[PDB]
Amino acid sequence: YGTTVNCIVEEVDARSVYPYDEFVLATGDFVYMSPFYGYREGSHTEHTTYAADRFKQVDGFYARDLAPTTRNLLTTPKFTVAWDWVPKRPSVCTMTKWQEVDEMLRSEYGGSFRFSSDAISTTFTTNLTEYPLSRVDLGDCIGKDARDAMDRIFARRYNATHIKVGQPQYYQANGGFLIAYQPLLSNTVERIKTTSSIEFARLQFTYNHIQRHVNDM
């Protein structure tokens, strides 16, 4: 008989999917534990499968030359995954910013809002009622991303001719799209599912452009 021990430390990238109950690792082995599970900020309410004795958390942890922060370690029956703990709500979101339209016209016709974007040639249809952000699960980052994008765009382009009007307005359009909208004035809980193609919206915009033109002329 002959044994062998090779202590191996590998910096892999883990991945988790909604509802972030467990995360996979680059080595193809699951860890059945929420990435945000911990003790602070009421993180104990997160779902975990391993018993509490196999999980420990360290506050004020500094790495190795191989700004101390918190550390969230674990001992799976095969390995010991370790990742620095982060607050779930600002750490993860269930909606990704798709496009930043500099000028997206909003119009009301037939009891709906027709957000037409001539820049990307795409028209969405949404209800008049503003979609509440509370209805979106883990959607706090949506507000931050939208505000940053609109502030950047306004400073770059619109600060000389137009002004903003109030807080941004959020509407949910057909196909599973959330349109964070900020109206401008010239100086003169559930998870939403999104379609896999914007072909319907592009065709709607093209048909609307052609139809308005031919109808007017």
Partner: antibody
């Protein structure tokens, strides 16, 4: 001419609720939003509540979570502010501030015309 | 919560003088500030919104400026009807907050 006549203010011992109402003469409901702003003695102004043109959009100040209620009736042009469990810090000059009109249906969070004021105090 | 710092708390200027008042923010609000004044014994009236827009009836001498987290209301050649308290109010986020207030009493 726009006139914000508001009543329902008076001395109330701490512990229970109170009701405030406002009447609009020139300002037309269902066309503009309405706010409630209070001004405690010795301090500056403080935003409390806002109601949309129709009433489907309600936003409250962080200090009136679960304690204040706002409503409007566009038929009689009367704005209702109902507060529950008013504390001593709520002593303030409550004005029925009107949100400025910039677009047909938008709440601008800026007050173009204010009410005269009303005495709302919580003493024991 | 966005914190308003309308400094200085008080000033003094005579008729025809120029005066400036400064409002600071805990974070950038992107021109989403409003300036309010109250004549003694009078209800507040809107003066500036979007930080550089003046409504109908506002004297052209009044003017707002600044960007980001810095916004200053400048009054040039102040008349008798311009000496009153001034309040800077933001509306970028929630809850809405007002400024501390500045006073301009004639010497």
């Amino acid at each position: 001419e726009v006139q914000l006549v508001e009543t329902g203010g008076g001395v109330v011992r701490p512990g229970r609720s109170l009701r405030l109402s406002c009447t609009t003469s020139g300002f037309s409901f269902s066309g503009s939003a309405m706010h409630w702003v209070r001004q405690a003695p010795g301090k500056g102004l403080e935003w409390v509540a806002v109601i949309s043109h129709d009433g489907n959009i309600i936003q409250y100040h962080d200090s009136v979570k679960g304690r204040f209620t706002i409503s409007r009736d566009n038929s009689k042009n009367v704005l209702l502010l109902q507060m529950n469990s008013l504390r001593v810090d709520d002593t303030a000059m409550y004005y029925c501030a009107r949100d400025v009109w910039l677009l047909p249906a938008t709440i601008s969070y800026a007050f173009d015309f204010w009410g005269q004021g009303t005495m709302v105090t919580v003493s024991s | 919560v966005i914190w308003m710092t309308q400094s200085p708390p008080s000033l003094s200027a005579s008729i025809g003088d120029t005066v400036t008042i400064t409002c600071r923010a805990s974070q950038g609000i992107s021109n989403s500030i409003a300036w309010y004044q109250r004549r003694p014994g009078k209800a507040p009236e809107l003066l500036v919104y979007a930080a550089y827009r003046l409504q109908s009836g506002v004297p052209s001498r009044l003017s707002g400026s600044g960007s980001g987290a810095e916004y200053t209301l400048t009054i040039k050649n102040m008349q008798p009807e311009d000496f009153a308290t001034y309040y800077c109010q933001q509306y970028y986020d929630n809850p809405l907050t007002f400024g501390g207030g500045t006073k301009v009493e004639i010497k």
